Structures are given as structure tokens and as C-alpha cells.
PDB file of C-alpha atoms in Angstrom:
ATOM      1  CA  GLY D   1      -4.001  30.369 -35.498  1.00 41.80           C
ATOM      2  CA  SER D   2      -3.001  28.680 -38.817  1.00 43.03           C
ATOM      3  CA  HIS D   3       0.403  26.890 -39.379  1.00 43.38           C
ATOM      4  CA  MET D   4       1.544  24.373 -42.079  1.00 41.72           C
ATOM      5  CA  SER D   5       5.116  23.007 -41.780  1.00 42.82           C
ATOM      6  CA  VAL D   6       7.556  20.242 -42.800  1.00 40.84           C
ATOM      7  CA  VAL D   7      10.554  19.824 -40.432  1.00 39.55           C
ATOM      8  CA  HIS D   8      13.404  17.274 -40.740  1.00 40.12           C
ATOM      9  CA  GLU D   9      15.819  17.498 -37.721  1.00 38.74           C
ATOM     10  CA  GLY D  10      18.815  15.356 -36.540  1.00 39.37           C
ATOM     11  CA  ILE D  11      19.854  14.809 -40.144  1.00 40.11           C
ATOM     12  CA  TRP D  12      23.155  12.932 -40.560  1.00 38.51           C
ATOM     13  CA  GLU D  13      24.703  14.228 -43.835  1.00 35.07           C
ATOM     14  CA  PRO D  14      27.785  12.397 -45.159  1.00 36.07           C
ATOM     15  CA  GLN D  15      29.743  13.846 -48.106  1.00 31.59           C
ATOM     16  CA  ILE D  16      29.885  11.450 -51.137  1.00 32.03           C
ATOM     17  CA  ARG D  17      31.953  13.712 -53.447  1.00 35.38           C
ATOM     18  CA  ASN D  18      33.470  17.187 -53.154  1.00 32.95           C
ATOM     19  CA  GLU D  19      36.135  19.140 -55.078  1.00 32.59           C
ATOM     20  CA  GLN D  20      37.333  22.661 -54.234  1.00 29.67           C
ATOM     21  CA  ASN D  21      40.234  25.148 -54.484  1.00 29.38           C
ATOM     22  CA  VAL D  22      39.202  26.799 -51.167  1.00 30.69           C
ATOM     23  CA  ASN D  23      42.245  27.314 -48.867  1.00 32.69           C
ATOM     24  CA  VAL D  24      40.514  26.152 -45.682  1.00 31.81           C
ATOM     25  CA  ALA D  25      42.999  27.879 -43.321  1.00 30.29           C
ATOM     26  CA  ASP D  26      43.134  31.170 -45.296  1.00 28.91           C
ATOM     27  CA  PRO D  27      40.241  31.327 -47.825  1.00 29.40           C
ATOM     28  CA  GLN D  28      40.612  33.717 -50.794  1.00 28.14           C
ATOM     29  CA  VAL D  29      37.761  35.542 -52.625  1.00 25.30           C
ATOM     30  CA  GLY D  30      36.812  33.637 -55.790  1.00 24.48           C
ATOM     31  CA  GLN D  31      37.714  30.147 -54.479  1.00 27.31           C
ATOM     32  CA  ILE D  32      34.833  27.584 -54.978  1.00 29.96           C
ATOM     33  CA  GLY D  33      33.744  24.052 -54.120  1.00 26.70           C
ATOM     34  CA  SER D  34      31.029  21.671 -55.381  1.00 25.49           C
ATOM     35  CA  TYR D  35      29.551  18.798 -53.371  1.00 25.73           C
ATOM     36  CA  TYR D  36      27.218  15.782 -53.436  1.00 24.54           C
ATOM     37  CA  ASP D  37      25.946  14.703 -49.982  1.00 28.96           C
ATOM     38  CA  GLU D  38      23.442  12.119 -48.764  1.00 30.07           C
ATOM     39  CA  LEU D  39      20.980  12.969 -46.009  1.00 33.39           C
ATOM     40  CA  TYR D  40      19.676  10.418 -43.454  1.00 34.84           C
ATOM     41  CA  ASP D  41      16.767  11.194 -41.085  1.00 35.58           C
ATOM     42  CA  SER D  42      17.115  10.882 -37.249  1.00 34.61           C
ATOM     43  CA  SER D  43      16.422   7.096 -37.729  1.00 38.19           C
ATOM     44  CA  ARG D  44      19.431   6.846 -40.178  1.00 37.62           C
ATOM     45  CA  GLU D  45      17.013   5.944 -42.988  1.00 37.76           C
ATOM     46  CA  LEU D  46      17.764   7.716 -46.363  1.00 38.15           C
ATOM     47  CA  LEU D  47      15.967  11.080 -46.750  1.00 41.56           C
ATOM     48  CA  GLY D  48      17.658  11.954 -50.073  1.00 44.13           C
ATOM     49  CA  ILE D  49      20.609  13.862 -51.582  1.00 44.15           C
ATOM     50  CA  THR D  50      21.853  17.453 -52.081  1.00 41.55           C
ATOM     51  CA  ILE D  51      23.990  18.710 -54.972  1.00 44.12           C
ATOM     52  CA  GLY D  52      25.467  22.194 -54.591  1.00 46.05           C
ATOM     53  CA  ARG D  53      28.357  24.641 -54.707  1.00 47.52           C
ATOM     54  CA  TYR D  54      29.838  27.527 -52.703  1.00 45.80           C
ATOM     55  CA  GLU D  55      32.109  30.538 -53.319  1.00 45.71           C
ATOM     56  CA  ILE D  56      34.190  32.755 -51.013  1.00 47.47           C
ATOM     57  CA  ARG D  57      32.718  36.144 -51.960  1.00 50.05           C
ATOM     58  CA  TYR D  58      34.024  38.857 -49.589  1.00 49.66           C
ATOM     59  CA  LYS D  59      35.679  39.584 -46.196  1.00 48.15           C
ATOM     60  CA  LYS D  60      34.467  42.008 -43.552  1.00 49.28           C
ATOM     61  CA  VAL D  61      36.609  44.394 -41.408  1.00 48.55           C
ATOM     62  CA  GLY D  62      35.700  42.261 -38.346  1.00 47.80           C
ATOM     63  CA  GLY D  63      37.154  39.148 -40.145  1.00 50.44           C
ATOM     64  CA  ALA D  64      33.925  37.340 -41.330  1.00 51.54           C
ATOM     65  CA  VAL D  65      34.481  35.371 -44.567  1.00 47.72           C
ATOM     66  CA  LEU D  66      31.161  35.608 -46.441  1.00 44.48           C
ATOM     67  CA  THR D  67      30.541  32.533 -48.561  1.00 47.60           C
ATOM     68  CA  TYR D  68      27.606  32.023 -51.008  1.00 45.51           C
ATOM     69  CA  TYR D  69      26.022  28.544 -51.152  1.00 44.33           C
ATOM     70  CA  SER D  70      23.527  27.255 -53.771  1.00 48.37           C
ATOM     71  CA  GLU D  71      22.081  23.733 -53.800  1.00 47.77           C
ATOM     72  CA  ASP D  72      19.145  21.477 -54.774  1.00 46.36           C
ATOM     73  CA  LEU D  73      17.861  18.786 -52.320  1.00 50.61           C
ATOM     74  CA  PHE D  74      16.079  15.760 -53.903  1.00 50.44           C
ATOM     75  CA  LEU D  75      14.275  14.104 -50.954  1.00 47.95           C
ATOM     76  CA  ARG D  76      11.862  11.097 -50.577  1.00 49.44           C
ATOM     77  CA  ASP D  77       8.950  13.598 -49.926  1.00 45.89           C
ATOM     78  CA  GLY D  78       9.860  16.432 -52.423  1.00 47.03           C
ATOM     79  CA  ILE D  79      12.455  18.864 -53.923  1.00 47.96           C
ATOM     80  CA  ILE D  80      13.919  22.062 -52.341  1.00 48.13           C
ATOM     81  CA  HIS D  81      16.119  24.871 -53.763  1.00 47.72           C
ATOM     82  CA  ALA D  82      18.303  26.555 -51.098  1.00 47.07           C
ATOM     83  CA  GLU D  83      20.877  29.388 -51.449  1.00 46.34           C
ATOM     84  CA  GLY D  84      22.398  32.191 -49.384  1.00 47.74           C
ATOM     85  CA  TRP D  85      25.145  33.328 -47.042  1.00 47.12           C
ATOM     86  CA  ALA D  86      27.312  31.677 -44.414  1.00 45.35           C
ATOM     87  CA  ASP D  87      30.367  32.970 -42.496  1.00 47.29           C
ATOM     88  CA  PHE D  88      33.120  30.431 -43.387  1.00 46.12           C
ATOM     89  CA  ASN D  89      34.482  31.047 -39.808  1.00 47.14           C
ATOM     90  CA  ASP D  90      31.109  29.852 -38.352  1.00 48.47           C
ATOM     91  CA  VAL D  91      31.383  26.825 -40.680  1.00 50.98           C
ATOM     92  CA  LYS D  92      34.924  25.874 -39.502  1.00 48.79           C
ATOM     93  CA  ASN D  93      34.054  26.554 -35.785  1.00 50.51           C
ATOM     94  CA  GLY D  94      31.015  24.120 -35.753  1.00 53.35           C
ATOM     95  CA  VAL D  95      28.491  27.019 -35.475  1.00 52.49           C
ATOM     96  CA  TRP D  96      25.041  26.453 -37.023  1.00 52.17           C
ATOM     97  CA  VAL D  97      24.879  28.082 -40.473  1.00 51.26           C
ATOM     98  CA  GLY D  98      22.169  28.181 -43.133  1.00 49.03           C
ATOM     99  CA  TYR D  99      20.063  30.196 -45.573  1.00 47.93           C
ATOM    100  CA  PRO D 100      16.631  30.461 -47.232  1.00 48.08           C
ATOM    101  CA  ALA D 101      14.959  27.499 -48.921  1.00 49.23           C
ATOM    102  CA  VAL D 102      11.855  27.241 -51.173  1.00 52.89           C
ATOM    103  CA  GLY D 103       9.791  24.139 -52.026  1.00 53.84           C
ATOM    104  CA  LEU D 104       9.700  23.136 -55.667  1.00 51.28           C
ATOM    105  CA  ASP D 105       7.814  19.786 -55.459  1.00 53.58           C
ATOM    106  CA  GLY D 106       5.966  17.235 -53.295  1.00 57.22           C
ATOM    107  CA  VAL D 107       5.190  18.221 -49.698  1.00 57.92           C
ATOM    108  CA  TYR D 108       7.345  21.458 -49.929  1.00 60.18           C
ATOM    109  CA  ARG D 109       5.327  23.016 -52.799  1.00 60.73           C
ATOM    110  CA  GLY D 110       3.997  26.418 -51.626  1.00 63.73           C
ATOM    111  CA  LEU D 111       6.263  26.371 -48.561  1.00 62.10           C
ATOM    112  CA  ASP D 112       9.604  28.134 -47.771  1.00 64.23           C
ATOM    113  CA  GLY D 113      11.995  28.413 -44.772  1.00 63.02           C
ATOM    114  CA  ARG D 114      15.633  27.420 -44.134  1.00 63.25           C
ATOM    115  CA  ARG D 115      18.208  24.707 -44.772  1.00 61.60           C
ATOM    116  CA  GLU D 116      20.743  24.651 -41.897  1.00 63.06           C
ATOM    117  CA  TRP D 117      23.790  22.548 -40.935  1.00 61.60           C
ATOM    118  CA  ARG D 118      26.871  22.495 -38.665  1.00 60.33           C
ATOM    119  CA  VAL D 119      30.241  20.716 -38.682  1.00 61.30           C
ATOM    120  CA  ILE D 120      30.591  18.229 -35.764  1.00 63.20           C
ATOM    121  CA  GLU D 121      34.051  16.953 -36.753  1.00 59.02           C
ATOM    122  CA  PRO D 122      36.278  17.895 -39.730  1.00 57.20           C
ATOM    123  CA  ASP D 123      35.848  15.410 -42.694  1.00 60.68           C
ATOM    124  CA  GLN D 124      32.982  13.678 -40.712  1.00 62.46           C
ATOM    125  CA  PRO D 125      29.290  13.878 -41.661  1.00 61.27           C
ATOM    126  CA  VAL D 126      27.541  17.154 -40.844  1.00 63.82           C
ATOM    127  CA  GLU D 127      24.307  17.537 -38.810  1.00 66.87           C
ATOM    128  CA  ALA D 128      21.508  19.194 -40.848  1.00 66.47           C
ATOM    129  CA  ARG D 129      17.937  20.465 -40.396  1.00 67.19           C
ATOM    130  CA  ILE D 130      15.213  21.522 -42.860  1.00 68.92           C
ATOM    131  CA  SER D 131      12.286  23.673 -41.759  1.00 70.11           C
ATOM    132  CA  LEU D 132       9.659  24.958 -44.304  1.00 67.04           C
ATOM    133  CA  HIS D 133       6.311  26.717 -43.524  1.00 63.05           C
ATOM    134  CA  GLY D 134       3.264  27.841 -45.511  1.00 63.10           C
TER     135      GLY D 134
ATOM    136  CA  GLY W   1      33.103  44.562 -27.199  1.00 62.25           C
ATOM    137  CA  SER W   2      33.882  45.652 -30.816  1.00 64.59           C
ATOM    138  CA  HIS W   3      31.239  47.187 -33.215  1.00 64.48           C
ATOM    139  CA  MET W   4      31.633  49.187 -36.497  1.00 63.77           C
ATOM    140  CA  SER W   5      28.412  50.435 -38.166  1.00 63.89           C
ATOM    141  CA  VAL W   6      26.873  52.898 -40.659  1.00 62.03           C
ATOM    142  CA  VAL W   7      23.128  53.567 -40.115  1.00 60.89           C
ATOM    143  CA  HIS W   8      20.880  55.915 -42.153  1.00 60.15           C
ATOM    144  CA  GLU W   9      17.309  56.079 -40.666  1.00 60.94           C
ATOM    145  CA  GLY W  10      14.204  58.257 -41.422  1.00 62.60           C
ATOM    146  CA  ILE W  11      15.038  58.174 -45.119  1.00 59.53           C
ATOM    147  CA  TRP W  12      12.419  59.823 -47.359  1.00 60.75           C
ATOM    148  CA  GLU W  13      12.573  57.954 -50.719  1.00 59.74           C
ATOM    149  CA  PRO W  14      10.578  59.420 -53.630  1.00 59.11           C
ATOM    150  CA  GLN W  15      10.209  57.437 -56.877  1.00 59.02           C
ATOM    151  CA  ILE W  16      11.633  59.306 -59.947  1.00 62.41           C
ATOM    152  CA  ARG W  17      10.830  56.619 -62.568  1.00 60.94           C
ATOM    153  CA  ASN W  18       9.216  53.176 -62.481  1.00 62.78           C
ATOM    154  CA  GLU W  19       7.717  50.831 -65.103  1.00 65.65           C
ATOM    155  CA  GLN W  20       6.117  47.445 -64.381  1.00 66.61           C
ATOM    156  CA  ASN W  21       3.589  44.833 -65.584  1.00 67.54           C
ATOM    157  CA  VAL W  22       2.840  43.781 -61.961  1.00 69.08           C
ATOM    158  CA  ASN W  23      -0.951  43.518 -61.347  1.00 65.66           C
ATOM    159  CA  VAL W  24      -0.907  45.246 -57.956  1.00 64.39           C
ATOM    160  CA  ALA W  25      -4.287  43.820 -56.828  1.00 62.60           C
ATOM    161  CA  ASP W  26      -3.597  40.252 -58.069  1.00 62.44           C
ATOM    162  CA  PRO W  27       0.143  39.810 -58.844  1.00 62.20           C
ATOM    163  CA  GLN W  28       1.139  36.960 -61.201  1.00 60.96           C
ATOM    164  CA  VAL W  29       4.441  34.984 -61.126  1.00 62.74           C
ATOM    165  CA  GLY W  30       6.865  36.393 -63.711  1.00 59.80           C
ATOM    166  CA  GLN W  31       5.591  40.008 -63.571  1.00 54.66           C
ATOM    167  CA  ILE W  32       8.463  42.574 -63.037  1.00 52.74           C
ATOM    168  CA  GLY W  33       9.154  46.240 -62.343  1.00 54.95           C
ATOM    169  CA  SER W  34      12.237  48.498 -62.516  1.00 55.01           C
ATOM    170  CA  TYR W  35      12.691  51.714 -60.536  1.00 54.65           C
ATOM    171  CA  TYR W  36      14.893  54.775 -59.962  1.00 53.78           C
ATOM    172  CA  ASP W  37      14.402  56.447 -56.543  1.00 52.27           C
ATOM    173  CA  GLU W  38      16.123  59.293 -54.710  1.00 52.35           C
ATOM    174  CA  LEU W  39      16.931  59.000 -51.017  1.00 53.13           C
ATOM    175  CA  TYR W  40      16.959  61.980 -48.598  1.00 54.37           C
ATOM    176  CA  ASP W  41      18.345  61.715 -45.037  1.00 54.10           C
ATOM    177  CA  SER W  42      16.218  62.626 -41.941  1.00 54.46           C
ATOM    178  CA  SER W  43      17.213  66.311 -42.632  1.00 52.38           C
ATOM    179  CA  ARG W  44      15.754  66.039 -46.226  1.00 53.86           C
ATOM    180  CA  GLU W  45      19.256  66.577 -47.641  1.00 54.15           C
ATOM    181  CA  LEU W  46      20.138  64.256 -50.630  1.00 52.39           C
ATOM    182  CA  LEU W  47      21.761  60.951 -49.565  1.00 54.02           C
ATOM    183  CA  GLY W  48      21.830  59.485 -53.101  1.00 51.82           C
ATOM    184  CA  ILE W  49      19.884  57.239 -55.509  1.00 51.80           C
ATOM    185  CA  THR W  50      18.883  53.566 -55.957  1.00 49.97           C
ATOM    186  CA  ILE W  51      18.339  51.773 -59.273  1.00 51.61           C
ATOM    187  CA  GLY W  52      16.717  48.338 -59.090  1.00 52.75           C
ATOM    188  CA  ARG W  53      14.136  45.787 -60.180  1.00 52.04           C
ATOM    189  CA  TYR W  54      11.759  43.202 -58.693  1.00 52.01           C
ATOM    190  CA  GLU W  55       9.937  40.040 -59.827  1.00 52.44           C
ATOM    191  CA  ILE W  56       6.918  38.139 -58.474  1.00 52.88           C
ATOM    192  CA  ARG W  57       8.522  34.706 -58.044  1.00 49.94           C
ATOM    193  CA  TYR W  58       6.130  32.357 -56.185  1.00 47.97           C
ATOM    194  CA  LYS W  59       3.026  32.117 -53.929  1.00 45.80           C
ATOM    195  CA  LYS W  60       2.725  30.202 -50.677  1.00 46.18           C
ATOM    196  CA  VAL W  61      -0.278  28.106 -49.466  1.00 46.31           C
ATOM    197  CA  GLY W  62      -0.856  30.738 -46.731  1.00 47.76           C
ATOM    198  CA  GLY W  63      -1.143  33.459 -49.480  1.00 45.68           C
ATOM    199  CA  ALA W  64       2.331  35.185 -49.249  1.00 45.80           C
ATOM    200  CA  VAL W  65       3.472  36.583 -52.627  1.00 45.19           C
ATOM    201  CA  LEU W  66       7.272  36.185 -52.620  1.00 44.08           C
ATOM    202  CA  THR W  67       8.955  38.903 -54.648  1.00 45.05           C
ATOM    203  CA  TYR W  68      12.722  39.133 -55.439  1.00 41.21           C
ATOM    204  CA  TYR W  69      14.324  42.606 -55.366  1.00 43.05           C
ATOM    205  CA  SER W  70      17.818  43.559 -56.641  1.00 43.44           C
ATOM    206  CA  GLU W  71      19.246  47.087 -56.541  1.00 47.27           C
ATOM    207  CA  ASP W  72      22.381  49.276 -56.341  1.00 48.19           C
ATOM    208  CA  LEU W  73      22.445  52.377 -54.040  1.00 46.25           C
ATOM    209  CA  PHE W  74      24.890  55.181 -55.042  1.00 48.82           C
ATOM    210  CA  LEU W  75      25.131  57.363 -51.899  1.00 48.21           C
ATOM    211  CA  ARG W  76      27.191  60.488 -50.904  1.00 48.34           C
ATOM    212  CA  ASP W  77      29.332  58.247 -48.546  1.00 51.92           C
ATOM    213  CA  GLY W  78      29.611  55.013 -50.682  1.00 51.75           C
ATOM    214  CA  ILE W  79      27.951  52.266 -52.826  1.00 50.21           C
ATOM    215  CA  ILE W  80      25.778  49.307 -51.647  1.00 50.45           C
ATOM    216  CA  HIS W  81      24.412  46.217 -53.475  1.00 50.21           C
ATOM    217  CA  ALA W  82      21.152  44.895 -51.948  1.00 47.89           C
ATOM    218  CA  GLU W  83      18.945  41.938 -53.026  1.00 47.71           C
ATOM    219  CA  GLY W  84      16.507  39.443 -51.520  1.00 51.22           C
ATOM    220  CA  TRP W  85      12.930  38.585 -50.628  1.00 50.36           C
ATOM    221  CA  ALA W  86       9.841  40.546 -49.661  1.00 49.47           C
ATOM    222  CA  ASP W  87       6.190  39.453 -49.258  1.00 50.40           C
ATOM    223  CA  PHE W  88       4.306  41.701 -51.751  1.00 51.79           C
ATOM    224  CA  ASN W  89       1.375  41.612 -49.213  1.00 51.27           C
ATOM    225  CA  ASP W  90       3.687  43.164 -46.535  1.00 52.06           C
ATOM    226  CA  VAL W  91       4.684  45.764 -49.163  1.00 51.59           C
ATOM    227  CA  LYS W  92       1.054  46.744 -49.992  1.00 49.64           C
ATOM    228  CA  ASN W  93       0.011  46.708 -46.257  1.00 47.92           C
ATOM    229  CA  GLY W  94       2.763  49.238 -45.167  1.00 47.46           C
ATOM    230  CA  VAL W  95       4.724  46.528 -43.255  1.00 49.54           C
ATOM    231  CA  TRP W  96       8.515  46.980 -43.033  1.00 52.60           C
ATOM    232  CA  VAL W  97      10.239  44.826 -45.672  1.00 52.73           C
ATOM    233  CA  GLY W  98      13.885  44.413 -46.657  1.00 54.21           C
ATOM    234  CA  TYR W  99      16.816  42.119 -47.433  1.00 56.50           C
ATOM    235  CA  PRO W 100      20.609  41.734 -47.182  1.00 55.49           C
ATOM    236  CA  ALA W 101      23.006  44.452 -48.318  1.00 55.78           C
ATOM    237  CA  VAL W 102      26.817  44.472 -48.819  1.00 53.93           C
ATOM    238  CA  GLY W 103      29.164  47.479 -49.067  1.00 54.98           C
ATOM    239  CA  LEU W 104      31.025  47.887 -52.329  1.00 57.84           C
ATOM    240  CA  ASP W 105      32.718  51.302 -51.786  1.00 57.73           C
ATOM    241  CA  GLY W 106      33.411  54.241 -49.444  1.00 59.14           C
ATOM    242  CA  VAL W 107      32.331  53.879 -45.808  1.00 56.50           C
ATOM    243  CA  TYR W 108      30.417  50.561 -46.518  1.00 54.51           C
ATOM    244  CA  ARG W 109      33.495  48.646 -47.781  1.00 49.56           C
ATOM    245  CA  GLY W 110      33.961  45.535 -45.585  1.00 48.97           C
ATOM    246  CA  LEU W 111      30.510  45.981 -44.030  1.00 49.19           C
ATOM    247  CA  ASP W 112      27.128  44.231 -44.662  1.00 51.75           C
ATOM    248  CA  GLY W 113      23.585  44.340 -43.171  1.00 54.43           C
ATOM    249  CA  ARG W 114      20.129  45.271 -44.519  1.00 53.31           C
ATOM    250  CA  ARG W 115      18.287  47.738 -46.737  1.00 53.71           C
ATOM    251  CA  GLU W 116      14.691  48.151 -45.476  1.00 55.02           C
ATOM    252  CA  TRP W 117      11.644  50.253 -46.441  1.00 55.94           C
ATOM    253  CA  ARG W 118       7.858  50.543 -45.962  1.00 56.21           C
ATOM    254  CA  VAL W 119       4.983  52.156 -47.874  1.00 55.54           C
ATOM    255  CA  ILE W 120       3.382  55.063 -45.921  1.00 50.97           C
ATOM    256  CA  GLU W 121       0.873  56.020 -48.635  1.00 53.54           C
ATOM    257  CA  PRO W 122       0.304  54.520 -52.120  1.00 52.47           C
ATOM    258  CA  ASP W 123       2.200  56.512 -54.872  1.00 50.82           C
ATOM    259  CA  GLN W 124       3.839  58.657 -52.069  1.00 49.85           C
ATOM    260  CA  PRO W 125       7.524  58.459 -51.091  1.00 49.76           C
ATOM    261  CA  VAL W 126       8.532  55.432 -49.022  1.00 47.38           C
ATOM    262  CA  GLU W 127      10.381  55.515 -45.658  1.00 48.92           C
ATOM    263  CA  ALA W 128      13.743  53.669 -45.814  1.00 50.09           C
ATOM    264  CA  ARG W 129      16.608  52.636 -43.511  1.00 51.09           C
ATOM    265  CA  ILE W 130      20.131  51.310 -44.166  1.00 52.68           C
ATOM    266  CA  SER W 131      22.085  49.486 -41.470  1.00 52.95           C
ATOM    267  CA  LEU W 132      25.553  47.919 -42.204  1.00 54.20           C
ATOM    268  CA  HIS W 133      28.044  46.448 -39.648  1.00 58.97           C
ATOM    269  CA  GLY W 134      31.621  45.145 -39.726  1.00 60.43           C
TER     270      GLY W 134
END
């Protein structure tokens, strides 16, 4: 019946600044990073920016490295807060990761959903998608 | 191939103490509650306790009332931290809700998964399930 949504797909997301003490090969609990990325829509026009951080939080018996991300996305059409869990192994292996997102402003107000991304190439821009629903 | 899991299903979860300023009929953003529940396994033997809180955080255009829960479960076989989102409408309507959980101690250490529950009857014990995986 009734559906309201805002979807941005085929995002090209270059990293403008990032600092971290995360051992990429062998991450240790308590290591962190902070980042400032631009986002470009599928037409490589500017969509906005994200500012965020992440922390290696725990390891599972099966080897997953559970990492907690928190960020704010300031886009042409509104503002989104996104935070949650990713397996750092999925990150490194170019698997799609992501976590819940809530609209704060503009078209996203009263919506929520997910902020997702994947590595294509180490130290190359990431692919991202944003999908929020009423 | 390889699977490690701890599952407790058919939990009977009576409320021992709870205080709140949540308007159940018409919840307002910023209202909270805190609770202390016992859990009994499907044999109505004691499994342990949970101590937690919840907060009405935001409303969606479609009418969902997004509520943030945080708790700690102290069980016979270990300790679990669980927190995340539920639609307060799903809660009131006896729909299954729940959110991520991580093992801190005993059999749950190095596992994660979900803590879930549903209302059977207002002011009657809830049904719960716990499912963590390696």
C-alpha cells in the first residue's frame, strides 16, 4: 500500500582526511579512526560530506572483528545520523557493510533505514548507498 | 560448515519492578522507563535476570514510535549486553521485537546475536528468546 523513501545509490565516496591507530592486518580492541569523506551521486555531482569515527570493539570465536561506526552525513537534501556494527573482515574483503540511519533534517526527517558502503580498491574511493523509509 | 551457538527459546519473563513516565496510549519523545525482569527457561526453571531501560526517541511519518532499549542479562550460563531499536507500536500489538546482543561472560563470550521478546497479554509476563552465534 503506502511507501515513502529517499534512496541514493552508486555513490562514489572519496576520503578527504582520516587518522587512525588501527592495525589493518591485525586489528586490536580499542584501536580507533576518524574520517571526513565527500559523497558524489551516480552522476559524480556533489551529494555532501560525512564526518565519523570507528572503534575495534570485540572479536568472535569464528574470527569476526566487530567494529562500531558513528557518523553524521550533511547532504544537499538533508542531514542523517548513522551508527552501528560492521565486521572489519567484511570491510577489508570488499563485502557490503552498513548500519542503521535516522533522518534529522530536510527530506530525511521522519524517515530511517541504512547507510551502506563497500571497499572497491584499498586507498581508493568507496561505493556507498543510502536508503531511508517512512 | 562451522557453527557455534547458544539459544534459549520459550522464555517466560515476568516483570519484578518497573517505573516509567511513558504515556502508553500516546508516547512522547524523551519519556523513559527502567525495568528488572526474571527469565525462566521453557521448563520454568530460573535462567536469570535482566536490568534495563528504554526511551521514546523519535516518530516516523508512517507513525512508527522508535524506542531505544539498553539492558544487561545476568544468566546461569553467562552475561549478555543487549541494546537497540523497537517500534513501540510493535511492542503494544504483541509483535516480536528485539535488537543486537553481545556475550560478555561464560558461554556467550566471543558470541553475538539478538535478544527478542513479545507481549502476550498487557501486564502479564512476556515471551523472550536469546540467540547468539560465533
